[PDB]
Motif scaffolding. Structure first.
Motif: not given
Length: 273
Positions: A121-129, A158-164, A202-206, A237-243
């Motif tokens: 599962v991919l999440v992309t995010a523009y986190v509020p500044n 399912k495992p996660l990918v979080l980017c953005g 979650v957990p995630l890894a950088d 400020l821009d990451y790929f975080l992973l299960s």
């Protein structure tokens, strides 16, 4: 103190060839980024999936050149309802995701797209500044809490990918001037703890720091002012975080510091799935 991203590792520790290439880019104005040849770089990079943040463009005004990327022909967009010229994110993919959702279930800010693919599962995010003068740090904090929770009720399956653009430098290693910012949006103690809690809960890894724990001066944003970009005075400020389940598939996680078009640069993930 200028950085030179290592070469692309397209093979996993287990020795498998990368099958999936995800690229994330805060374009800080989609139309202007297009006029500065962004799509030309993406055509060359040729990712299987492209995530874009801070598009600042309504669906109605989305330039038709976007349809000229047929290897990224499935495109999903999210914009804020009332706010115009603000936030906005996009996810362009070679294959259709099995399901696409928008937001984090409170509500509309146009910051998060969730796409469920075959293996993850991919999440992309523009986190509020947090805002100049931390004028919106208190909105960022509730967002962080809410986001963490939404993501927990997400990576159960399912495992996660979080980017953005996560709008936080985690540790001092992640910007050039840690001391002159510990009270500026992006390096406050609250935000940095939010990012630590994100990785814990979650957990995630950088993904990047996993492969390059010692590497300094590796940034993805430089203010347009002064010549911070040329002086590599910047933030990561821009990451790929992973299960953790995904770490064995992790071939490389890049910073494309040479790619112009915005005050952020793209980052690229290689996974062997």
């Amino acid at each position: 103190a200028l950085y030179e991203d290592p070469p692309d590792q397209k093979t996993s520790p287990s020795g498998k060839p990368a099958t999936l290439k995800i690229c994330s880019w805060n374009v800080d104005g989609l139309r202007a980024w297009i006029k500065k040849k962004g799509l030309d770089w993406v055509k060359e990079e040729a990712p299987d999936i492209l995530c874009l943040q801070e598009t600042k463009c309504s669906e109605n005004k989305l330039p038709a050149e976007l349809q000229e990327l047929p290897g990224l022909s499935h495109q999903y967009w999210s914009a804020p309802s009332d706010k115009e010229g603000y936030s906005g994110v996009g996810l362009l993919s070679r294959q259709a995701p099995l399901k696409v959702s928008y937001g984090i279930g409170d509500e509309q800010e146009g910051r998060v797209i969730v796409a469920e693919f075959d293996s993850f599962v991919l999440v992309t995010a523009y986190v509020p500044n947090a805002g100049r003068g931390l004028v919106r740090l208190e909105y960022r904090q509730r967002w962080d809490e809410a986001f963490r929770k939404f993501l927990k009720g997400l990576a159960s399956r399912k495992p996660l990918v979080l980017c953005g653009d996560l709008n936080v430098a985690h540790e001092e290693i992640d910007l050039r001037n840690p001391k002159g910012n510990k009270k500026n949006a992006g390096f406050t103690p609250q935000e940095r703890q939010g990012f630590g809690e994100l990785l814990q809960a979650v957990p995630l890894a950088d993904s990047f720091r996993h492969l390059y724990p010692n590497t300094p001066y590796a940034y993805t944003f430089w203010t347009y002012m002064m010549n911070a970009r040329s002086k590599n005075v910047g933030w990561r400020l821009d990451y790929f975080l992973l299960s953790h389940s995904l770490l064995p598939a992790l071939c490389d996680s890049k910073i494309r510091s040479k790619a112009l078009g915005s005050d952020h640069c793209p980052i690229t993930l290689y996974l062997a799935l």
